[PDB]
């Protein structure tokens, strides 16, 4: 979605290939916006169990 | 400014000067059944969003202080409004100042 254009994706656009918004998103978000890490309880590299 | 809690001034019903109990006037609660409020609520009802303008460009930071007079005569009980020039400071009957004492 970063390389996509901003009309067809909420992550597209900008002069640099960056997201510009937190990729973790609530599942209360509507269609067309609920894109990325859906309802992430813990977002990162997993250590341990 | 400082104003006293009593003031002898003209009374409308009596027709002469009588002492009056002095306090500040306060805005009352807006009635839900007023003509403009009922007109506003019927207009605000349904779809269309906000219909009337909402003031946002707050410019001045003071108010015109209004005194609520009170006739001390037991049978008069006349009330009337009195306007004073705008001031940020206001108090009733406080700290009557002297003329040049030793301050610290």
């Amino acid at each position: 979605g970063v390389a996509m254009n901003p009309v067809e994706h909420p992550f597209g656009g900008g002069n640099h290939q960056h997201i510009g918004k937190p990729s973790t998103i609530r599942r209360d978000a509507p269609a067309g916006r609920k894109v990325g890490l859906i309802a992430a309880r813990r977002t990162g590299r997993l250590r341990g169990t | 400014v400082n104003v006293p809690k009593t003031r002898r001034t003209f009374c409308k019903k009596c027709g002469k000067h009588q002492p009056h109990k002095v306090t500040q006037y306060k805005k009352g609660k807006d009635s839900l059944y007023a003509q403009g409020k009922r007109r506003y609520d019927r207009k605000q009802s349904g779809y269309g969003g906000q219909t009337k303008p909402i003031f946002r460009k707050k410019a001045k930071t003071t108010k015109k202080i209004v005194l609520r007079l009170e006739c001390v005569e037991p049978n008069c009980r006349s009330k009337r409004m009195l306007a004073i020039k705008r001031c940020k400071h206001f108090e009733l009957g406080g700290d009557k100042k002297r003329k040049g004492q030793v301050i610290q």
């Binding site: 009309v7 994706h9 909420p10 067309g32 894109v35 | -």
Partner: protein
């Protein structure tokens, strides 16, 4: 204003599953008197790739 790729997968007609050469639905045997009380013997004819 454009409809994103994630929304376009719900309408189908492009992203539908390719089930032309699939052999069938992989299910278990339906319940009857045999399963409920006793047993029934079945022969493995052949094993095929789906």
């Amino acid at each position: 204003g454009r409809v994103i790729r994630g929304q376009r997968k719900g309408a189908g007609s492009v992203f539908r599953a390719h089930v032309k050469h699939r052999k069938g639905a992989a299910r278990l045997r339906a319940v009857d008197f045999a399963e409920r009380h006793g047993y029934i013997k079945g022969i493995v004819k052949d094993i095929i790739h789906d």
